[PDB]
Design a protein around this ligand. Structure first.
Ligand SMILES: Nc1ncnc2c1ncn2[C@@H]1O[C@H](COP(=O)(O)OP(=O)(O)O)[C@@H](O)[C@H]1O
Ligand SMILES: Nc1ncnc2c1ncn2[C@@H]1O[C@H](COP(=O)(O)OP(=O)(O)O)[C@@H](O)[C@H]1O
Ligand SMILES: Nc1ncnc2c1ncn2[C@@H]1O[C@H](COP(=O)(O)OP(=O)(O)O)[C@@H](O)[C@H]1O
Ligand SMILES: [Mg+2]
Ligand SMILES: [Mg+2]
Ligand SMILES: [Mg+2]
Lengths: 43, 429, 58, 435, 428
């Protein structure tokens, strides 16, 4: 499926793909998330 | 538009009011007799009286046949449909050659549709029914419509209440109501009620400008072939048709007759106006015998456009025949149905004029001695070759920091690039 | 009849909210204070003011 | 005045064959000039078509180019009228990528045979004077129609109520109701809608009130060709292929079923066969396979009258190496009658030029007529015809009223015929390609 | 590692090897000799870059092995990847799916790039809470906002099953929702993950960003997309059929309007048709008219034929092209290589193939190439390299060249040996 191209035409967009590439979670952030593991009022 | 083509300098037949061709005007040089006859052909097209009249441009290569056809097209304007074709295009893989020919015939007959719609559009301000005693009974439905110009109240027929609830029209909704049917159509909440905090896109629209009641004229230009294609395959059967490849179809004469009837009805009703135009078939000698025979019947039709053929083949064997030679690769039977306009070879002076006009259109500064040298090259070789040397010589000059072509640049470009004859000489050796 | 012909009062024009921090046309509202704002700096200022207020009040 | 779809074509002057009651052609009638023997033969063939008793009669119109073969065919078509089908095809039209040549010839033959269906229908026709529809929120309704002679109140069923609502029938509408299927058609309005209603921006003319009884037994005539029946029965969505032409090779079993049921419909009173004409112009473009099919195809009882035209002499039959008269095999030539057309004289050419000038609305002097007749005799008839139009345009350019000799000489010098163009091509032959 | 692209017949060529003044440098960028032809190719490349003049045709004509395709590859490399360069063989147009004229039109339109700019306003953020009227709460690393939801918007949120913790993009111009992924967190770790699940960081900056995006397409792609409802599928399968003239004309006019509005840019490229003498008279006649269009790319052609029969006709013409099309183009002529040029070509090929050869080996291989053909010597380079490696050597010697010369024959020697035993071969 890593080579499936036509399946991406109905699933993603080039700008969305660039956003996904930029904002992918790095290893250190997952390590930190595993290591660590708002009342509204109408003013 | 912006890019410069081989014919981008042709702006029309340089004819005077008396129908005579100026020596050099509208980008055309010489071809006086051929431009005058093209002028009579342009008058024939604009007269709209005749159908199926054929004219053959015949003459040596590089004698302006295609330039004269595009000049006729420029003279006719953008209203008249001018359909260029080349004879190689009839050999389609989806449909028969006669279908390609008939389709291109119908592409050159234009139709101009005139639609006049009366609409009452605005933001709804009230939807109060008018109760009454029957001779709860309502006799009218009052709708108040607001636009940037003002407000209007409409005493609509009571039956519109069904459409109002079907369209879910509410106060503050922008709608439009067509005069004829009286059916309401809703087009979104007025943008004056849109906040920046709510998320919707289609459901908001700006308040209509102009008067609440509007009379709109919509003019659409179509071809008879456009109607043919539209009525041949209207757009689960639609799902299968759109999944499968929508090949061209051999449209039947029944459909074309029905469409002719409908267009005649529109012309009688005044809704539409016909604009018969021109089909230009360049390299017509690529057609085969079956195509030429079909063209015999096609040119005799009262619906056919005016067709412009071009050939340079001389006495050549007709395609699809064996050893049957004809004066232009066209059977003599078709040649009896066409008027022939001869095109003649250019003089060195005319070649220089064309080279100068081309340089002007390409935006190239050419020196007088360079122009003379390129003209003399063009009296050898061909006109097309000498024209083609213009822009590479301009680039060579720009490399050498010269804003104008000097003779040395023409010499160098000629030394780099060769013409058909020099290459034939090299091949022979 | 009243189902088919509801006498709906015309919708009130919304309040064109303005950001109290920069006095620009409001584009957002903070979910926690329900106060509109127009920029990230406005959001930070509003949340700092809100934590100041909530510390002062209790 | 207004530019119609149909303009002045190459045969727009042909209105018929120009014959009397005894089929003796007139010198100049219905746009025909000369061709007395050919026109008399065309009249006899047209009578044979109109009698319809004989199937698969083939006539070939053979003659020199420009002698009036297509003109005679168009005259036959005009004198036949629209009731009798007349399918004209170019011989090159049968070479298709959608179907075989034999399938194309079958569809051409079956297109030239009309089937005139008749059925009786119950038709209600009257002015809506009152309509009441009551629905929950089953539907009930009451409709009253008037026709000057009577006024009847009807109690409406649910399906009729649905149809009336869909058609949006209102009082003052002159409507027609087909009792056989409930289809509702509106002929027109009888008076305006209430002036008090806004929008409704129309003041359409009001049709006159119907007369006689409300419900009448009406006989209606519907004509379809055999090809339409075939295409409709070929598949579930066949009717769409009548316009797009996406008809594959229709199964022969379906065609046999249709031939049988049509024979039953003509033994019964349901339909009448209208056999027509298939005109294959330039028939020499057909190959040996098409002629061989035409041989057997004319022996069918459902075959129409086949008219053919060709100017080829003894020439090679396409797809073969054999030479035969007219480019047609002797086996098919045996199955047809040949009608020969003769070259015209000075008087006939002048009369043809006069008729063409009349149809093109070109006023032209008698000296111009003489010089143009000389040109047409020297060069060709069609060339002179095209010089008529060119000289008209040149005369109107100079603001003249009558095309004179100077205009004809001008357009002659401007536009070349085949002979002068060929001479100039030979004079500059080295400039043209491949000598 | 063996990438998809390996050492081919033109891998050593990385441009035309010209200077700023277009003066051809000997042995530059992999090109050797062909000075006049390389200068002409540089002039044509400048024409292509300028773009002002549509439908200029150039025919690179010469003897076999004289670098015509080498010059074409150098032009393709020197020309940037931004500019289209459609390289096809003459035989690629003879298709059962579409007419030859359609194939040439598609090659023409593929060689014209159109670069379309677009600005959109989208809201991208991480979903904090959703309440079924409706309310949606979004946040970034710098902001938090709450929106009110319409009927269609709540329907879209429900159908896509947007759940708290997702990162979504909503376009204000169209009101459509796209789920970029779900943010990873202490509680959202699982033992297995779905195929669609993508982990993504919370978006930065402001929620309502203003975008500027530029799409690079070609006229052929636009034609195919507009050919039918699911036309873009044909951009993969190639089952485009024959695209109708209506679609092409409407696209040319729409692109003209876009360029007038400044939305799109047109990047005219090159259509290289190698071995062009496979085209028939119908193809050449179509090209004669096709080059007169203002959307025509610069056309480059290559052939080695002399005065030969035009395909589809009985006529003989120079380069197998009718003189109608020859008058419409400029001809660049290649020249046979000298001994020095042959040796330098062999040296560059050895350097690309990573082959170390002795000087005597260079002399003998150059003699073999001059006597038989350059391509044969190029092939013998790697042949002798393999034979030397099998010998556990580190430098290719003359003995290895003699060995491969005896193992692999050329056209002349093979023909002589075939004629010697012609009684055994078929249909002599
Ligand atoms: N009389 C003329 N005046 C100006 N330009 C001309 C003239 N004749 C030809 N040209 C130009 O020179 C080139 C000749 O090509 P074309 O007219 O297509 O010749 P052909 O008759 O071989 O088709 C075109 O670019 C055309 O615009
Ligand atoms: N007898 C005639 N009466 C009137 N017009 C004729 C007659 N014969 C020929 N014409 C006209 O002269 C032209 C000759 O073309 P056509 O009749 O098609 O000849 P053919 O079919 O024999 O080649 C047409 O415009 C035709 O209408
Ligand atoms: N100008 C050149 N510089 C370097 N190598 C060349 C040159 N021309 C040809 N070659 C070499 O010869 C082969 C390319 O020849 P090619 O261009 O295909 O000849 P043709 O003109 O017959 O197409 C390649 O293997 C390449 O190494
Ligand atoms: Mg031309
Ligand atoms: Mg005829
Ligand atoms: Mg090559």
């Amino acid at each position: 499926s890593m080579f499936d191209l036509i399946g991406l035409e109905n699933k993603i967009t080039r700008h969305e793909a660039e956003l996904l590439s930029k904002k992918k979670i790095p290893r250190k952030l997952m390590e930190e998330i595993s290591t660590s593991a708002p009342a509204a009022a109408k003013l | 538009t912006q890019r410069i083509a081989s014919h981008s300098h042709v702006k029309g037949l340089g004819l005077d009011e008396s129908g005579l061709a100026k020596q050099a005007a509208s980008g055309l040089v010489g071809q006086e007799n051929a431009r005058e006859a093209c002028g009579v052909i342009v008058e024939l097209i604009k007269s709209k009286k005749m159908a199926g009249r054929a004219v053959l441009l015949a003459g040596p290569p590089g004698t302006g046949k295609t330039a004269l056809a595009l000049a006729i097209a420029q003279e006719l304007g953008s209203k008249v449909p001018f359909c260029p074709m080349v004879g190689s295009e009839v050999y389609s893989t989806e449909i028969k050659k006669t279908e390609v020919l008939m389709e291109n015939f119908r592409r050159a007959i234009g139709l101009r549709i005139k639609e006049t719609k009366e609409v009452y559009e605005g933001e709804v301000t009230e939807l109060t029914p008018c109760e009454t005693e029957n001779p709860k009974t309502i006799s009218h439905v009052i709708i108040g419509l607001k636009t940037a110009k003002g407000t209007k109240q409409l005493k609509l027929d009571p039956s519109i209440f069904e459409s109002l609830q079907k369209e879910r029209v509410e106060a503050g909704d922008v709608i439009y109501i067509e005069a004829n049917s009286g059916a309401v159509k809703r087009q979104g909440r007025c943008d004056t009620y849109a906040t920046e905090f709510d998320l919707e896109a289609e459901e908001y629209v700006p308040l209509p400008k102009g008067d609440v009641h509007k009379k709109k004229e919509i003019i659409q230009d179509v071809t008879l072939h456009d109607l043919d294609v539209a009525n041949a395959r209207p757009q689960i059967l639609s799902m299968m048709g759109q999944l499968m490849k929508p090949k061209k179809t051999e449209i039947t004469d029944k459909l074309r007759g029905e469409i002719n009837k409908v267009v005649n009805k529109y012309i009688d009703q005044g809704i539409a106006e016909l604009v018969p135009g021109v089909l230009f078939v360049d390299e017509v000698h690529m057609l085969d015998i079956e195509c030429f025979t079909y063209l015999h019947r096609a040119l005799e039709s009262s619906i056919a456009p005016i067709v412009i053929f071009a050939s340079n083949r001389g006495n050549c064997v007709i395609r699809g025949t064996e050893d049957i030679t004809s004066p232009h690769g066209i059977p003599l039977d078709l040649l009896d149905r066409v008027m022939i306009i001869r095109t003649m070879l250019y003089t060195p002076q005319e070649m220089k004029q064309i080279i100068k006009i081309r340089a002007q259109t390409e935006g190239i500064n050419i020196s007088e001695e360079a122009l003379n040298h390129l003209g003399e090259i063009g009296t050898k070789t061909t006109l097309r070759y000498s024209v083609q040397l213009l822009t590479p010589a301009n680039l060579l000059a720009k490399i050498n920091g010269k804003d104008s072509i000097e003779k040395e640049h023409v010499e160098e470009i000629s030394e780099l690039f060769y013409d058909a004859k020099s290459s034939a000489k090299i091949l022979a050796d | 009849f009243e189902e088919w012909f509801p006498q709906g009062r015309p919708p009130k024009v919304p309040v064109r909210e303005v950001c109290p921090v920069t006095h620009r046309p409001a584009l957002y509202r903070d979910p926690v204070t329900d106060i509109p704002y127009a920029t990230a700096r406005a959001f930070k200022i509003i949340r700092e003011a809100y934590k100041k207020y909530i510390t002062a009040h209790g | 005045d207004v530019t119609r779809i149909e303009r002045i074509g190459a045969h727009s002057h042909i209105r018929g064959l120009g014959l009397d009651d005894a089929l003796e052609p007139r010198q100049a009638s219905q746009g025909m000039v000369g061709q007395l023997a050919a026109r008399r033969a065309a009249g006899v063939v047209l009578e044979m078509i109109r009698e319809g008793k004989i199937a698969g009669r083939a006539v070939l119109i053979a003659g020199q180019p420009g002698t009036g073969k297509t003109a005679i065919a168009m005259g036959m078509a005009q004198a036949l009228g629209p009731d009798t089908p007349f399918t004209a095809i170019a011989g090159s039209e049968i070479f298709s990528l959608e179907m075989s040549k034999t399938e194309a010839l079958t569809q051409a033959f079956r297109r030239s045979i009309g089937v005139r269906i008749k059925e009786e229908t119950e038709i209600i026709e009257g002015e809506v004077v009152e309509i009441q529809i009551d629905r929950p929120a089953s539907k009930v309704g009451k409709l009253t129609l008037k026709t000057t002679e009577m006024e009847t109140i009807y109690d409406l069923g649910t399906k009729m109520i649905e149809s009336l609502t869909k058609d949006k029938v209102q009082a003052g509408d002159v409507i027609t109701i087909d009792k056989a299927t409930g289809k509702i058609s509106k002929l027109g309005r009888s008076f305006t809608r209430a002036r008090d209603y806004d929008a409704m921006g129309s003041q359409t003319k009001f049709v006159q009130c119907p007369d006689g009884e409300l419900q009448k037994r009406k006989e209606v005539v519907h004509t379809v060709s055999l090809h339409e029946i075939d295409v409709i029965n070929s598949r579930t969505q066949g009717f769409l292929a009548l316009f797009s032409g996406d008809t594959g090779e229709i199964k022969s079993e379906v065609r046999e079923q249709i031939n049988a049921k049509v024979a039953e419909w003509r033994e019964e009173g349901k339909a009448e066969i209208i056999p027509g004409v298939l005109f294959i112009d330039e028939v020499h473009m057909l190959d040996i396979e098409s002629f061989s099919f035409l041989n057997r195809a004319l022996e069918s009882d459902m075959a129409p009258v086949l008219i053919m035209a060709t100017n080829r002499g003894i020439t090679r039959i396409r797809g073969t190496s054999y030479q035969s008269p007219h480019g047609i095999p002797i086996d098919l030539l045996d199955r047809l009658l040949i009608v020969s057309t003769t070259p015209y004289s000075e008087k006939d050419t002048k009369q043809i030029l006069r008729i063409r000038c009349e149809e093109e609305d070109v006023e032209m002097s008698e000296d111009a007529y003489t010089v143009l007749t000389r040109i047409g005799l020297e060069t060709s008839l069609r060339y002179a015809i095209q010089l008529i139009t060119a000289a008209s345009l040149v005369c109107r350019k100079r603001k003249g009223t009558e095309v004179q000799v100077d205009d004809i000489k001008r357009v002659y010098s401007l536009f070349l015929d085949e002979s002068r163009s060929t001479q100039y091509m030979k004079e500059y032959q080295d400039a043209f390609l491949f000598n």
